[model samples]
Target: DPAKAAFNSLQASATEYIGYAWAMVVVIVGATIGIKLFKKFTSKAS
Candidate 1:
Protein backbone atom coordinates (compact mmCIF):
# COMPACT_ATOMS: atom_id res chain seq x y z
CA ASP A 1 0.00 0.00 0.00
CA PRO A 2 2.81 2.37 0.82
CA ALA A 3 4.50 1.65 -2.52
CA LYS A 4 1.29 2.25 -4.37
CA ALA A 5 0.69 5.46 -2.50
CA ALA A 6 4.16 6.69 -3.36
CA PHE A 7 3.62 5.89 -7.00
CA ASN A 8 0.37 7.83 -6.96
CA SER A 9 2.05 10.78 -5.30
CA LEU A 10 4.82 10.79 -7.86
CA GLN A 11 2.37 10.70 -10.69
CA ALA A 12 0.33 13.56 -9.22
CA SER A 13 3.38 15.77 -8.87
CA ALA A 14 4.72 14.87 -12.27
CA THR A 15 1.42 15.63 -13.95
CA GLU A 16 1.40 19.05 -12.36
CA TYR A 17 4.86 19.93 -13.64
CA ILE A 18 4.64 18.22 -17.02
CA GLY A 19 2.63 21.07 -18.51
CA TYR A 20 5.31 23.55 -17.46
CA ALA A 21 8.07 21.34 -18.79
CA TRP A 22 6.27 20.88 -22.10
CA ALA A 23 5.66 24.60 -22.43
CA MET A 24 9.34 25.30 -21.89
CA VAL A 25 10.22 22.79 -24.56
CA VAL A 26 7.79 24.39 -26.98
CA VAL A 27 9.10 27.91 -26.30
CA ILE A 28 12.69 26.83 -26.77
CA VAL A 29 11.94 25.05 -30.01
CA GLY A 30 9.84 27.95 -31.34
CA ALA A 31 12.49 30.49 -30.49
CA THR A 32 15.16 28.40 -32.14
CA ILE A 33 13.16 28.08 -35.34
CA GLY A 34 12.23 31.77 -35.30
CA ILE A 35 15.87 32.83 -35.03
CA LYS A 36 16.92 30.47 -37.78
CA LEU A 37 14.26 31.83 -40.09
CA PHE A 38 15.14 35.44 -39.25
CA LYS A 39 18.79 34.90 -39.96
CA LYS A 40 18.07 33.19 -43.24
CA PHE A 41 15.82 36.04 -44.33
CA THR A 42 18.35 38.72 -43.48
CA SER A 43 21.15 36.88 -45.20
CA LYS A 44 19.12 36.47 -48.37
CA ALA A 45 17.87 40.06 -48.34
CA SER A 46 21.38 41.48 -47.77
Candidate 2:
Protein backbone atom coordinates (compact mmCIF):
# COMPACT_ATOMS: atom_id res chain seq x y z
CA ASP A 1 0.00 0.00 0.00
CA PRO A 2 2.83 2.39 0.77
CA ALA A 3 4.42 1.76 -2.58
CA LYS A 4 1.18 2.36 -4.40
CA ALA A 5 0.62 5.58 -2.52
CA ALA A 6 4.11 6.77 -3.35
CA PHE A 7 3.63 6.01 -7.00
CA ASN A 8 0.39 7.96 -7.08
CA SER A 9 2.03 10.96 -5.46
CA LEU A 10 4.88 10.86 -7.90
CA GLN A 11 2.51 10.82 -10.84
CA ALA A 12 0.53 13.77 -9.46
CA SER A 13 3.71 15.75 -8.93
CA ALA A 14 4.86 15.01 -12.44
CA THR A 15 1.57 16.19 -13.89
CA GLU A 16 1.67 19.42 -11.88
CA TYR A 17 5.19 20.19 -13.03
CA ILE A 18 4.22 19.51 -16.62
CA GLY A 19 1.32 21.93 -16.30
CA TYR A 20 3.60 24.64 -14.94
CA ALA A 21 6.14 24.09 -17.71
CA TRP A 22 3.49 24.39 -20.39
CA ALA A 23 2.06 27.55 -18.80
CA MET A 24 5.48 29.17 -18.75
CA VAL A 25 6.07 28.26 -22.38
CA VAL A 26 2.70 29.59 -23.50
CA VAL A 27 3.18 32.88 -21.68
CA ILE A 28 6.61 33.40 -23.22
CA VAL A 29 5.44 32.63 -26.73
CA GLY A 30 2.35 34.81 -26.40
CA ALA A 31 4.34 37.74 -25.01
CA THR A 32 6.87 37.53 -27.83
CA ILE A 33 4.21 37.55 -30.50
CA GLY A 34 2.18 40.28 -28.76
CA ILE A 35 5.19 42.59 -28.54
CA LYS A 36 6.02 42.16 -32.18
CA LEU A 37 2.48 42.85 -33.26
CA PHE A 38 2.24 45.88 -30.98
CA LYS A 39 5.36 47.39 -32.41
CA LYS A 40 4.31 46.75 -35.96
CA PHE A 41 0.91 48.35 -35.49
CA THR A 42 2.20 51.34 -33.51
CA SER A 43 5.17 52.14 -35.71
CA LYS A 44 3.26 54.58 -37.85
CA ALA A 45 2.18 56.65 -34.83
CA SER A 46 5.68 56.80 -33.42
- Model 1, 1-46: lDDT tens digits are 9999999999999998998999999999999999999999999999
Worst 10 residues of 2 by lDDT: 37-46
The whole-model lDDT of each prediction reads 0.98, 0.97
Q: How many clashes show up per model?
A: 0, 0
| Candidate 2 per-residue C-alpha lDDT over 1-46 given as tens digits, one digit per residue, 9 for 90 to 100 | 9999999999999999999999999999999999999999899678
Candidate 1 similarity to native, TM-score? 0.69
State how far residue 34 of model 2 sits from its true place (Å). 3.6
Cα lDDT, model 2, residue 41: 88
Which residue segments of model 2 deviate by more than 4 Å? 35-46
List per-candidate RMSD values in Å: 1.6, 2.6
Write out the backbone clash pairs for model 2: none
What's the TM-score of each model vs. the native? 0.69, 0.64
* Residue 1 of model 2, lDDT score: 97
